[PDB]
Design a protein around this ligand. Structure first.
Ligand SMILES: CN(CC(=O)O)C(=N)N
Ligand SMILES: CN(CC(=O)O)C(=N)N
Ligand SMILES: CN(CC(=O)O)C(=N)N
Ligand SMILES: CN(CC(=O)O)C(=N)N
Ligand SMILES: CN(CC(=O)O)C(=N)N
Ligand SMILES: [Zn+2]
Ligand SMILES: [Zn+2]
Ligand SMILES: [Zn+2]
Ligand SMILES: [Zn+2]
Ligand SMILES: [Zn+2]
Ligand SMILES: [Zn+2]
Lengths: 257, 255, 255, 256, 255, 254
C-alpha cells in the first residue's frame, strides 16, 4: 500500500492513526532557482523522495509537501532576486505549519516528522511548531511530539563527506545547487539535470556579514554557490542510503513502536 | 519541454517570462468517501492545467496542496479524519505571496484554477491584497483570471450526456459522479468503485449549524453517489473542461 | 419591551441570559442601483431579525454595518462609489470578538443572519475561530446557526409569484425584484421605482477577472431589473422568511 | 435630502463627492450604562450630533461603528459587566483603516471621526495612521482627517457650572452620569428611566490600574457618577453647544 | 545585590521566583526639546523602578526602549526627527509575549511602569490578551498593576511646592518642568538648561488633525517651558513617586 | 560627544543625519551559573559603542528581548529567566524601527546581532521594511546585518583563543567566548568559580519538541568557560571592533 496520505481513503488513514503510534512525515521544500543545470523544485523532490523511502522502511505515512518556502538568502541560496524563485513571507510559512499540526492533532495523530529540504525554512518551521504546541497545550494536549530536521544534516560520516568533497567540506550553506543536490537528482530524477550545463566556478565566499537590498553582483552569476561538475549517480545513491538509514534509525529511536 | 515551472531551470523560466500565462492549481487534502483517495482536489485541477497549458503554451506553478476548511453542505464537514485544512488567513496569505513573487519575476498574467469548493473567497481576498500592493508600486497591468474548473461543464448537451438522470448541483458533487469519473479516466488506481456507498443525494435545510453535526452528513463523507461513474464520463468532462478553459484563457490573455 | 439588546439596560440583558437566543444581522454598505439606497443589506436582515425575535422571544444585537468586498458576479463590483467594504480579516475578527463576548455574558445561542452575498465565508471563519478559542476554555456548549435570509424562500409557488420569467439565482438578484420588493414593503421612502433601469439579467462566463472590469457589469450596478417589484411581493417575501426562520430557530434552539 | 450616506443611492453619493464633501463617521460601542439607561448610548449620541452638524454644514454621515474597544474600569466600569460587547484593539483599528481606504477610493478627502466611547481614541488614531500610511504609498497626501470626542467641545464655564455645580468631575468618571443622561433625556427619553438612577458619590480610584479588573472597585450600578440631576433642559444646552462648536471647527478645518 | 533581572544568573532569578514582584519600565525614544536627550522616557521610569525595587525587594526587567507614536497634543507629534515609534500591534505584542514568558517562569505579580504618555492603551491591550491566554491554560492568579509614574504626584501640598505658579497638566508636561527637573536630579549631564526655549504653555482646540500639522506645535518640540526646572524639584518628585508607588505595590502585592 | 542616539537632543540627531546608524539586537537569556542574563545585549552594545567612536557612527537603543532560545544553541526556552518574543513580534519591531529611521532621512543601518536565535527574524523585518520603502520608490536605504562573533575567524586568532580547537559558535553559549568578553568588559557580572566544567554539548542531527530538558547540560551552558580569561576577552574585543569598523567603512564610505 502507498505510504502517501494523499493516496489513502479517509477510512484507511483513520485506521492507521487508530492503530496508535502512527508516524506522520511532512516534506518542507521550496520553488527556488538551482543554477543552469537543474530544475527549480529540487527542494521538494529530494526531501519527499527521502521521506517516501524512510516511510517504507519504518511503516510511516507521508503528507503532501509544502511547495513554497521562505525567501532565498544570498549566502545560502543566491538571493531572492533571481527569476523563478517564488518565496513566502515568514508569517505565511509559520502559519501553514501551525495549521497542519493543529489538524493532525485533531485527527488523533501525535507523532510528526518535519523534513526540511530548503536551507531558509528552519526557523519558521520551528516557530510554527512552537505556536501549534502552545495551542495544543491550551486544549489540554501535551503528548504531541515533533521531530524536525534538514535531511543533509544526517550526512555526517567523514568517509562519506570525503567521497563527496575530497578537497574539503565547505558547509551546507554554500552547497546550493552543488555536488550534494545534483548527485541526488542524478540518482533520482536524471531527466531534470543536465550536467553539461553546469558552470564550474570556484566555491562562493562571503565576508562575515549580510547586505540588503540583496546585491546581485556578490552571487555567482549562475545562481549556484558551488560547482556540481563532480556530481554523479553513484554519489547520489550513497547520499540517499546514508540519509534514509540515518533518518529511519532516528525516527525509530524517537518514536518507538 | 515541460509545462511545469518546477521542472524548468531559472534561465528557461526567465526566457519564457509579461506575455507568458502562468497557471496555479489550488486544491486540498480532504476526505472523498470510501472509494477514493484524499488528494483528488489537487490531482484534478493539476491535470486540467497541464493539458490546457500544453495546448496554449502556458506554464503551471506547483499547486497549493492544502485548502480551506471543509463545509458540511458541500464537503461533508471538517470533522472527518484525513481532511487537513488551513485557516482562511493562511490560504489568503499564500496566494498573496505567490502573486507578489510572480509579479517580481515580470509575469503579468495568472490563472488560478480552483479544485476545492471551499477555497474561492480566500483566493479572491489573496488576489485583492496582492493587487493592492502592486498598486502601491504603480503597477496595474497584472491581470488575474480565477475559476473552479467544474463551472466549464455547462453545455446542456454535455450535462445531459453526463447526467441522463439529471444534474444534482456542484455543491453536492463531492466524491460523486463528476470527480469519480474524472479519476477513473486519469488515475483509476486511486479509485475502487466497488467501495462506493450508493446513498441518495444529500439535502440540507436553508441554514448552517456550528459546531458541525456529523449526523447530518452521509456516513461515507460523500454528498452524492458515484455508482454510475465511468471512465467515459471522465474523458468527456476532461475534454470539455480543457477546451473551454483553453478558449477562455486565449480570450482573456491573447498571445 | 424591545427585542433589541442596545435598547436594554445591562440588568435587563443580564436577566434575559440568566433565564436565550441572540440574533446578529450582518450587512454591508453597498451600491444598489439608481433606484435604491446603499444600506439595504443591513436594513433587510435587521427587519427580519426583529420580526423573528418578536415571535420566538429572542434578542437582536446591533448589526454589522460593513461587510466583505462586493464581487462583480453578485454585486456589480467593489469599484463602485459608495460601496464601503472591509478586508476579510477585519470582518472575521469582528465576528470572532462578538462571539467571545457573548460567551462571556453566558450566552450560548447565536443566530447570525447574513444580508450581504459576500459575507458568508468570512462569517464562517469568524465562527470557527471563536469556537476554537471557547474550546481552549473548556466551553463546548455554544451553538451557532448561520443563514442568509433569502435561502428560506424556496416554495415554487412563491418563486413563480416573484419571478414569473424564471428564478435568476440569488447571485444575480442584486438590486432586483426580491430586495426592491422587500424595501417597498418596509422602507418605501428609500426606493424610487421610476429610476429603475430595466436591463436584461446580467450574465457572465464561467470565470472571474481581476482587477474588476467595470464594463463586464450593467452600468446601473444592478444585476437584474426591479421593474416588477411591489409592496405586495415584499409582504409575501417577508412572511415566508419570518415564518421559515422562526420555525428553524425554534427547532435548533428549543425552549 | 438625507445627510446619511446609507440612505443615498450610489449616484447621489458620487455626485456629492464630485473631494470637496465632508464625511462624518460616528464611533461608539455597546456598553453598560447603569440601571437607568440603555446600552447603545455611545452610538446614539455621537450619531445624533453628527446628524445635526451635517445638516448645518452640508456634510454626509457614514453608518456608525456599533462596537468599540474594551470598557476600562476608571472610565467605564470595566469590561466584566454583562451586555458590554467589546472588540480587540486590532479589530477596531482595522475597521477604521478599511473604511478610510474605501472612502479615499471613492475620491473623498475629508473625514471627521466622531468618537462617543471613551476607550476608542487610541485605536482610532492608529487606524488613521495606518490608512494614511497606505495612501502615501500611492502618492496620496491630500486626505485630511479630524478626530474628536464630542464632549470635549463642552468647555463653557457657564454650561459646565449648571451640569457640575460642585465642580467638573472629568470626562472619564462622567460615564452614565449627568452629561450623557441629560443628552438622552433630550433625544431619546423612552430609553431612560431616571427613577432607576442610583445616586452614589462620584467614583474615585488610586493612581494606577489593576488587571484582572476587580469588580469591587466599581460602583455596583456600573455608573461612575450619578445622573440624578440630569434633565431634558441640560441635554438641550449640551446639544446646542456641541453642534455649534463642532460645526464651527469643521468649517474652519474643511473650508468650502 | 542587584535588583535588575538582567544582572542576575538564571539560578538567582529562579530562587527569587510566584511571591516575587516583577517591574517592567515602558518608555520610548522621543524628541524632548533642544535642552534634553531623547531617551528620557526610558531613563526616568527605570530610575523609579530601581529605587522602588530596592525598598520593597522587587526585581526589574529590561525596559521597553521604543513606544507608541508621539501625538501632537501631548508629545509634539511623530513628525519630529529622532522619535522612533512602534505600531500599536508591535507594542501590544511585546507586552503580551513578556507576560506569557514571566508566567512560564512561575511569576504571578507584575508592575508595568509607563513613562511615555502614548503607551497606555497598547500596554492595556497587551495585558488583556496575555491574561486571556493564561486563562486558556487554566491560570487565573497572575495579577498586573499598570501605572504612569507621574500620576503619583498628586498631593496638593506637593504640586503647590513644585508649581507655585500653577499646575499645567500632564498632557503638556513634555520636556517641561517635571521631566527636566527629574533629569537634573538623576542625569544632569544629559540636560542643558541654557538651551531651553521659554515659550508659553502649548494649547490646542478640542480636536485632533491628521496628517499632523507641525505648525500647531511649538518649534522646539516641548509643550511647556522647563526654564524654572531645578534639581531640588526633581529630588522632591523622585521621593514622592518612589514612596507612593512603593506603598501602592505593597498594598496590591502584600508579602 | 556621545555616540548614543538616546543621549542626543533631536536637533543634534537631525544635524548628524552619510550618517551610519547602528542597532544592537540582543536577548534576556540564561547564561549558566556563572554569568548574568543580559549578556547578549551588553556585548553587541559594547562593540557598537567602540566601533561607533572609531568610525563616527551613532548607536540606537538596543533590542532587549530576542527570539526563543533553541536547545542546540542556547539550551532551550524552558529555562527560568529567559524571556523570549514570538517571531512576528521581533520581526515587527525591526520593521517599525527601519520605517522610522527612513522617515528621519537615514539610509545607512548596521544591525548587530548578539543572540544566536535572532537572525532570520531580523532578516524578515528588514525585508518587510525595504518592501514598504520600495512602494515609495526608495531604494537607497542600505542595511548591513551581522553577528559580531562571525568576525573572529583569523586562524591565528582562533589558535590563540582555542589552542586545543574551536568548538563552533552554536555551542559557544556561556562558554569561553562570551565569558572572556564579559571578564574584560563587565567582570562584576561574572564569577568563574561558579562555572560548571562539563564536556562540550553534543546533539543528534535533529530537534525535538516539546524541548526535552534532559538533553541539555544542567547548567544551561553548552561549553565550559573554565579557560575563559580577561586576556582572551581583550583580544576578541579588538578583533571584532577592528574588523567591523573596516567592514562598515567598506560598505558605507564617505
Ligand atoms: C542546503 N542548501 C540547499 C538549498 O536550500 O537549496 C543550501 N542552499 N545551502
Ligand atoms: C465540487 N466539490 C469538490 C470538492 O470541493 O472537494 C464539492 N465538494 N462540492
Ligand atoms: C443576494 N444579493 C444581495 C446583495 O448582497 O446585495 C446578491 N447581490 N446576490
Ligand atoms: C507625560 N509626558 C511625557 C512624555 O510622554 O514624553 C507628556 N509628554 N505629556
Ligand atoms: C554564540 N551564542 C550566543 C548566544 O545566543 O548566547 C550561542 N548561543 N551559541
Ligand atoms: Zn536546494
Ligand atoms: Zn473534491
Ligand atoms: Zn443587497
Ligand atoms: Zn457612554
Ligand atoms: Zn518624556
Ligand atoms: Zn549569549
Amino acid at each position: 500500500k502507498s505510504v502517501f496520505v494523499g493516496e489513502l481513503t479517509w477510512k484507511e488513514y483513520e485506521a492507521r492513526v487508530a492503530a496508535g503510534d502512527c508516524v506522520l512525515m511532512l516534506p518542507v521544500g521550496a520553488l527556488e532557482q538551482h543554477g543552469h543545470h537543474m530544475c527549480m523544485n529540487v527542494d521538494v523532490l529530494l526531501p519527499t523522495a527521502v521521506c517516501k523511502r524512510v516511510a517504507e522502511r519504518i511503516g510511516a505515512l507521508v503528507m503532501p509537501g509544502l511547495q513554497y518556502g521562505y525567501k532565498s538568502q544570498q549566502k545560502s541560496g543566491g538571493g531572492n532576486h533571481f527569476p523563478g524563485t517564488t518565496s513566502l513571507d515568514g508569517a505565511t510559512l509559520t502559519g501553514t505549519v501551525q495549521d497542519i499540526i493543529r489538524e493532525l492533532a485533531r485527527h488523533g495523530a501525535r507523532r510528526l516528522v518535519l523534513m526540511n529540504g530548503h536551507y531558509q525554512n528552519s526557523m519558521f518551521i520551528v516557530e510554527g511548531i512552537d505556536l501549534a504546541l502552545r495551542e495544543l497545550r491550551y486544549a489540554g494536549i501535551q503528548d504531541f511530539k515533533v521531530v524536525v530536521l534538514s535531511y543533509w544534516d544526517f550526512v555526517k560520516d567523514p568517509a562519506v563527506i570525503q567521497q563527496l568533497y575530497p578537497e574539503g567540506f565547505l558547509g551546507w550553506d554554500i552547497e546550493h545547487g552543488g555536488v550534494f543536490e545534483t548527485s541526488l537528482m542524478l540518482a533520482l530524477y536524471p531527466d531534470l539535470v543536465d550536467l553539461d550545463r553546469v558552470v564550474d566556478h570556484p566555491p562562493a565566499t562571503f565576508p562575515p556579514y549580510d547586505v540588503f537590498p540583496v546585491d546581485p553582483a556578490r552571487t555567482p552569476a549562475p545562481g549556484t554557490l558551488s560547482s556540481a561538475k563532480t556530481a554523479s549517480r553513484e554519489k547520489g545513491e550513497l547520499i540517499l542510503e546514508v540519509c534514509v538509514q540515518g533518518i529511519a534509525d532516528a525516527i525509530r529511536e524517537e518514536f518507538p513502536p
